[PDB]
Design a protein around this nucleic acid. Structure first.
Lengths: 56, 123, 209, 127, 71, 114
RNA sequence: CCCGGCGAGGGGAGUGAAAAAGAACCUGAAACCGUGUACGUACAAGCAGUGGGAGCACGCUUAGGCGUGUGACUGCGUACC
RNA sequence: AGGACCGAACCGACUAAUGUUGAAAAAUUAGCGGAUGACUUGUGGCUGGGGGUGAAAGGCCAAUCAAACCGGGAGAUAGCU
RNA sequence: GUGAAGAGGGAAACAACCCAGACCGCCAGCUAAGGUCCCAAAGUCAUGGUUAAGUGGGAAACGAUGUGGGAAGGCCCAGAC
RNA sequence: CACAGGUGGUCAGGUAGAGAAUACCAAGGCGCUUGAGAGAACUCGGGUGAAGGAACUAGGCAAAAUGGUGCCGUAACUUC
RNA sequence: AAUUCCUUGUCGGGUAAGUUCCGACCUGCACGAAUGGCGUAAUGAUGGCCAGGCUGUCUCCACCCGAGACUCAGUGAAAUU
RNA sequence: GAUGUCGGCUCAUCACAUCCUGGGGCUGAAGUAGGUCCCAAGGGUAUGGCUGUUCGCCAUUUAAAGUGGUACGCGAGCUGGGUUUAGAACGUCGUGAGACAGUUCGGUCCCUAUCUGCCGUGGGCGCUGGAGAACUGAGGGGGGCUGCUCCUAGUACGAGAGGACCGGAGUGGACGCAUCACUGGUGUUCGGGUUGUCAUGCCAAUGGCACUGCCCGGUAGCUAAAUGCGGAAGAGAUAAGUGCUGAAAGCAUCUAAGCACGAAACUUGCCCCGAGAUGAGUUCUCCCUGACCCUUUAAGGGUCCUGAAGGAACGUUGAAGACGACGACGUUGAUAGGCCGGGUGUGUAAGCGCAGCGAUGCGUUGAGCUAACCGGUACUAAUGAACCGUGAGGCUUAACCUU
């Protein structure tokens, strides 16, 4: 359907309020490297529970 | 059987060739029955060696279906094609006294004590 | 009267001495474990709580672990409870099984869960495809007119179009027990036990028929 | 529908599924180290390991079978020779996946796969 | 005035009865006598939320001992 | 699920095979049809491999005439009376269609072919 | 001088009377998108306005419901051509 | 041999499923019909709006046709909105 | 008459009805049409008659021993109806 | 418009196949760029279907309904 | 009958049964001899009917795969107001 | 400056003057049956054909084939069939252009939803210190239909033939929910077979591709065509109605006071959603017992010390499902992948023996290959933590606490 008036800018703010993407909290350290990572996941270029990861 | 406008094989001594479903029985609000149903037939063809002539309307029951009838072991015996033995439309039991081709398991209950008792077939 | 929590576990076509053999559903109903048992100040109504399910119980919320600790130990995150007019049992486990289901020869299998997700498959919200006249196109399965007008009642209550199956607990009400079996606790129920295969259920007895 | 079943089906019909696993298992056998999506990385575990298993002992019919699953001269030479006698001292887990992060070309969940005796890395970087 | 509502039916419409109200705690008869005596929407609601009634002559929701009153 | 897939092994009886279907054999069965009980027997070749899923059954093809008559007997129930073993043979595939349109002067198979 | 990728774009530092003149550069509405403060929004609703107003910052209100800006809540109330 | 046929490339579009704020101002997939003929068709040339041109539908004239366009009369006129 | 060409009061409201004629200000009084248990501003008014039906607060034909008052009248404590 | 549309001349390699249908293919073109994952209704293409065989419907509803080549074998009507 | 005011004409036939079809009939619309008539092989992507093959068009729909929907990331309209 | 049509399909919805069972008066009703007949919204209320069709005509199912409304329901649903729809042209008429609801041939129908509803679903907040667990019912809907015959019962009645319900019972038919063992279907993560070409140097052998090339079988899943199956004894308030006691009207009398009985509906019993129920909730189980400065102080601000129980992101992932949420659960780990034992599928893996002068088949080998499934196995990968959550938590009446 079409509309009947021009909508509000208060609406535009309301519709995107419950959509915006999440994150982990706190700047990490790891048990085996001075590298920060995403927590509870492999350090992207260093050691997290032995080994390194990633290519290309 | 499962539908109408459905020709199926004679397996009776009252018509020839094929004979024609005018409706399926055993329930309303549905133009399809399950296996083991009662059909209403009109004879589409007939021959003089069989007892009845065309466009007469009679009752019938299933004697073969290539899906099988749930009656015999818990595992449906699937006999070749759809085929039907005509009944009487009031007085019950087969009007035809023969079957064409082999014997069936579909003729060994209470309603079939006039066709197996004969020596020329299902004996 | 007491509802016994089963598990969907088994399916069997068992023969009977007549010329038909019967498909049946097999329910292990063993270890129904009390840890509370309520009485008639405890939420004001006397009823019995029983627990049947699958949990390691090492990494488990301490408010839950003490619930199990002060009485019968159990596993399972969720627990189920049932009203009664019979003698209530000691709260440190009772593990009562299939034997309850011979004093009635019908059960109400009630379920927990529902196992299909949507059931747009002509099961819970049903359809008929558009029967083809004049060269029909685009819509065949989207409902034609769900309302009426602002005098019949705009769009009426009690209509589904799309959504979810619910994942609630569903009855078939008063379905037959085929057999009860000691020494390994097997319930033969004849069919329509809810959920996907391997899902939990509740099985209470029939109070209606 | 997906109930009482475990495993992943991608966004390909079967002839392409055959081709993509014959591409990727050749890429594993040439490079020894791969990165791919988490759904692929699983199907990459399930494709290669029943072939390693067949391949511990030397069997001409099981070589015919590996060439039936993936058509390649590189792969049937590596198995039963270099990787077969290598993975002979195990009973599974002949490779391990490390959960590497999100894609860099666009966006999808990736996991790295790395043979169970290996711990090497390389990179493309210009910084 | 038997307080019909839309709630989904066939052939008719489903309703609450006056008769239901007595069997499911004594309050509801007393309750839709004082409700209907208050204004509009929002004010009639701000007023309403200050009434309590319950089962009556037996209800625990009186432990305060308020100011006693005969009217 | 902790008693299923075990329950496929339990139903399974010592006659159930792992073969190329097409031994002749004879299926002895009851005539339970109506309120009475006699016997009747069935012979042919079994063209399908039994015991699919939980329960075994015989799918005989008759092969004496050209007509697609397949018959299904449950192996695990008492309605099936007795089970005798006869002449050897092979079909491999669970289907034998070229005999359901014309076949005759034929009954038995005694080798699995060469 | 700082950040960045060879970049884009901006700041600091210095120019100048001015960059609240930084290159589309005159001063600069209104449409336009976002920040920052005050107070407000989870018994809560309609031409969004008028009448009545707890409350909060600032005015000794001459504290007697007021000025200024806002405002829980609510009586009353149908756009313009 | 054939203004016979089935049929590509080469040309068309009866039906059917879809597309229907498309991939595209009828095209697609697939059935279908001309293709040795009143066929298919390149180059160069020619008629200009109630005028051409039409195995004719009152069709076709720059993905448009039962009526192509601009510079002037022109502020056309409207018992009119 | 009113709207058209006028605010307000009352009516579940309205174009148009009834009271009424908007200079403007007034935590002023009075009266209208309309109201007075709460909604909602004022009488569950003082005194008496009657309906059992939410009639009141939805209409006619139409009927009856549904119920009461009133004057004239038949019957009418001698016995009514 | 990197438009599934339209458009003339010359040249003519291999196997299977009725042939320049068509599968694969010598020479060659070329990835016609949303991706990747899930597998809700549903929309569209594609697959596959019990039993019936149009029964759907005004209407067989494209292919999945028919197909090719060799061989045997052949009707009323007919301007032959 | 492409032709019938009435009429789904009347009767026979195929038949789920079939306004239509096929046959006969006239109670005959305004039929009727170049608005041409009657009969006819071939032919038409041409209409209706018939019996048989087959098939998800359908009884009644199930499930598989993929592209949108949906998920994450990107670019990025419109009817309207 | 748009309240826009027939016909077909879909999808509904409400009024009861109910098609029907059900309780009941009457009858010129003996009984059976019907006519007459009131209560009743509770529930089942049929379909294919021709025809664009209403209405028609015809066959038929089921015990059964109802009435009325809805911008003559529903083109911000579908097709676009119908009227010359726009087009000849038949039939018809006028000098003709042009027309015709007689007609035959095919033939352009839009909106991704602003607010509103309807159904499914998440975020955030009050739940009174916090946390996790069960949970009551303020509130509100669903089953709800209806034949058959055994018994009830060949009995009252009637001349005789004949002759019914409630209640128990199984079962058909409609209606609806779940289900995947059975019977089929499918199963692009499993086997074999097979045309063809291309290919592994070549052959014995074997394989990419052609719609998953094609065809049949297929674990686990899902599913209807298949499967299992509710539709309930009882109770109260009652309708129409049999009345008892009784007044208007000396009494009688369903009537005004008063009371037994009287239907699926209604209140329920049976079933299901439910504390946002601000009336803010109960009850079970766990945890937190340190301190000063400052301002408005049932309060908050700053800081040292310090925050448990628990939570969430994250992560492998599901038998949970649009996404989420919900759920197993991160080495205290069987989640998924492999892998082992087994299962179930297919139909004997290359080589060898043997048949076949070859493709290939069969005995060596009930083999080999194999997916989702059952149980084992830590083989593999799910970091050690951090962070949000704090140091016993309002006034006041009533109860208790030395109070």
């Amino acid at each position: 359907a079409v509309q009947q008036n021009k909508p509000t800018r208060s609406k535009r703010g309301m519709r995107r309020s419950h959509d915006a993407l999440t994150a982990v909290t706190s700047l990490s350290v790891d048990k085996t490297s001075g590298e920060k990572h995403l927590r509870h996941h492999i350090t992207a270029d260093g050691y997290y529970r032995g080994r390194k990861v990633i290519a290309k | 059987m499962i539908q109408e406008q459905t020709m199926l094989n004679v397996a009776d001594n009252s018509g020839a060739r094929r004979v024609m479903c005018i409706k399926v029985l055993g329930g309303s609000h549905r133009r399809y029955a399950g296996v083991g149903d009662i059909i209403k037939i009109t004879i589409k063809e007939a021959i003089p060696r069989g007892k009845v002539k065309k466009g007469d309307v009679l009752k019938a029951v299933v004697v073969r279906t290539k899906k099988g009838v749930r009656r015999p072991d818990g595992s449906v015996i699937r006999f070749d094609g759809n085929a039907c033995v005509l009944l009487n439309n009031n007085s019950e039991q087969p009007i035809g006294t023969r079957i064409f081709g082999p014997v069936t398991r579909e003729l060994r209950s209470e309603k079939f004590m006039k066709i197996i008792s004969l020596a020329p077939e299902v004996l | 009267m007491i509802g016994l929590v089963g598990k969907k576990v088994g399916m069997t076509r068992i023969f009977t001495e007549d010329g038909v053999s019967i498909p049946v559903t097999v329910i292990e109903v063993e270890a129904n474990r009390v840890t509370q048992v309520k009485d008639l100040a405890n939420d004001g109504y006397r009823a019995i709580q029983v627990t049947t399910g699958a949990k390691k119980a090492n990494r488990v919320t301490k408010p839950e672990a003490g619930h199990f600790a002060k009485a019968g130990v159990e596993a399972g995150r969720g627990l189920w409870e049932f009203r009664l007019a019979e003698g209530e049992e000691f709260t440190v486990g009772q593990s009562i099984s299939v034997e309850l289901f011979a004093d009635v020869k019908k059960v109400d299998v009630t379920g927990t869960s529902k196992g299909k997700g949507f059931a747009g498959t002509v099961k819970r919200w049903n359809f008929r495809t558009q029967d083809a006249t004049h060269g029909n196109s685009l819509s065949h399965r989207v409902p034609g007119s769900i309302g009426q007008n602002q005098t019949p009642g705009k769009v009426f209550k009690g209509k589904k179009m799309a959504g979810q199956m619910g994942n609630e607990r569903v009855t078939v009400q008063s379905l037959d027990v085929v057999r009860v079996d000691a020494e390994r606790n097997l319930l033969l129920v004849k069919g329509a036990v809810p959920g996907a295969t391997g899902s939990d259920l509740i099985v209470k007895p029939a109070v209606k028929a | 529908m997906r109930h009482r079943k475990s495993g992943r089906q991608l966004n390909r019909n079967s002839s392409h599924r055959q081709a993509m696993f014959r591409n990727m298992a050749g890429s594993l056998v040439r490079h020894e180290i791969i990165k791919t999506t988490l759904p692929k990385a699983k199907e990459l575990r399930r494709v290669v390991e029943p072939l390693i298993t067949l391949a511990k002992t030397d069997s001409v019919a099981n070589r015919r079978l590996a060439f039936a699953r993936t058509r390649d001269n590189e792969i049937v030479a590596k198995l039963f020779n270099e990787l077969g006698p290598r993975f002979a001292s195990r009973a599974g887990g002949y490779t391990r996946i490390l959960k590497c992060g999100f894609r860099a070309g666009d966006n999808a969940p990736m996991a790295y796969i790395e043979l169970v005796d290996r711990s090497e890395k390389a990179e493309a970087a210009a910084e | 005035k038997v307080y019909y509502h839309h709630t989904g039916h066939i052939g008719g419409i489903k309703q609450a009865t006056f008769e239901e109200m007595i069997a499911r705690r004594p309050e509801r008869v007393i309750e839709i006598a004082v409700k209907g005596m208050l204004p509009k929407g929002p004010l009639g609601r701000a007023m309403f939320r200050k009434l309590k009634v319950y089962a009556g002559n037996e209800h625990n929701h009186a432990a305060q001992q308020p100011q006693v009153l005969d009217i | 699920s902790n008693i299923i897939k075990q329950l496929e092994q339990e139903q399974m009886k010592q006659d159930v095979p792992s073969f190329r279907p097409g031994d002749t054999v004879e299926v002895k069965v009851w005539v339970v049809e109506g309120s009475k009980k006699r016997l009747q027997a069935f012979e042919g070749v079994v063209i399908a491999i039994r015991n699919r899923g939980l329960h075994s059954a015989f799918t005989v093809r008759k092969i004496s005439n050209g007509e697609g008559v397949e018959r299904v007997f449950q192996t695990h129930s008492p309605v099936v009376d007795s089970i005798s073993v006869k002449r050897r043979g092979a079909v491999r595939k669970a289907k034998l269609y070229y005999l359901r349109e014309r076949t005759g002067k034929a009954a038995r198979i005694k080798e699995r072919l060469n």
